[PDB]
Amino acid sequence: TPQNITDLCAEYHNTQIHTLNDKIFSYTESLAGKREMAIITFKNGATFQVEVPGSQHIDSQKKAIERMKDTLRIAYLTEAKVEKLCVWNNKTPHAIAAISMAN
């Protein structure tokens, strides 16, 4: 069991860490059919998604996808510093797997 986001990310193929240490610049959310997703950006232009739930996801991930959109919305609205994202880099934009917050 990893103790931090970097070691967690290392357990998975096709992932990488982005170190941001900054607040989210924009938060976008959609209920449109087949695009039920969120998108965040940072002031350097880096862009990330929480993917539409699909067949690549197992059942245990469906509650966690919902939690992650909750987390990103509140981080955005409270200007909370995002330390790192773990993302899958075989998607465009890169798809979030995990977030860490700290100062």
């Binding site: 919902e66 909750d70 919305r73 509140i74 609205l77 409270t78 200007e79 100062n103």
Partner: protein, 231 residues
């Protein structure tokens, strides 16, 4: 109402955000009262200003206009190549020093309004930049500010402050109107130091109660609702 107050300060916006607002001397964080702080208006008001606009003894000063804040700023901070003027909402943590201290106000010309425990980030509307004493007149808005909450609030009335005036225990004020009607136990009234200890405890109780109000307004919106039926 939506009136604003103004304060010159060399501490920049990122320090303010990290501290949770504009802090009195010796306090690093608004809500964290893990460290000792003397709270006394009279002492605050008679303190000298040596490269800091008055922020001692548990209060933080503001001016009633931008012009006044700028003047104050030139006098104290002219040695800095950059400083800020913070634009601040009125709320009941603010006291009109002349009104509360009356004839004993030590610098009545200044027309000070002072915030007990300092000014939380949410109360800060925005900030101007001052370069080499020259006011840059662009106003930078704070995303943390809450307009509907603060525009519905005013400074504290003087009668909420008389009891916190903090005059010396045997000062004539404690036997004169109005302060006589609000004197802490021991002030103009057998253990030594009662007046000082009660002045301090009334201040701490005020700030506890005020901080509760701020937590309620700000932390309320960190509540994330859950789909209870699904769970």
């Amino acid at each position: 109402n939506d009136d604003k107050l103004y304060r010159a300060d060399s501490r920049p916006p990122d320090e303010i955000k990290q501290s949770g607002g504009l802090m009195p001397r010796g306090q690093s964080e608004y809500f964290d009262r893990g460290t000792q702080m003397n709270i006394n208006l009279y002492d605050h008001a008679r303190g000298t200003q040596t490269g800091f606009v008055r922020h001692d003894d548990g209060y933080v000063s503001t001016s009633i206009s931008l012009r006044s804040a700028h003047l104050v700023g030139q006098t104290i901070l002219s040695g800095h190549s950059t400083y800020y003027i913070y634009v601040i909402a009125t709320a009941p943590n603010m006291f009109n020093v002349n009104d509360v201290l009356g004839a004993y106000s030590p610098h009545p010309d200044e027309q000070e309004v002072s915030a007990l425990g300092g000014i939380p980030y949410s109360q800060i509307y925005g900030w101007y930049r001052v370069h080499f004493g020259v006011l840059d007149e662009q106003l930078h808005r704070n995303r943390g500010y809450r307009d509907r909450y603060y525009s519905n609030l005013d400074i504290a009335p003087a009668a909420d402050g008389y009891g916190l005036a903090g005059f010396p225990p045997e000062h004539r004020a404690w036997r004169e109107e109005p302060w006589i009607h609000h004197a802490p136990p021991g002030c103009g009234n057998s253990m030594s130091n009662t007046c000082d200890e009660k002045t301090q405890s009334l201040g701490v109780k005020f700030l506890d109660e005020y901080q509760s109000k701020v937590k309620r307004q700000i932390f309320s919106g960190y509540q994330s609702e859950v789909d209870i039926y699904n769970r």
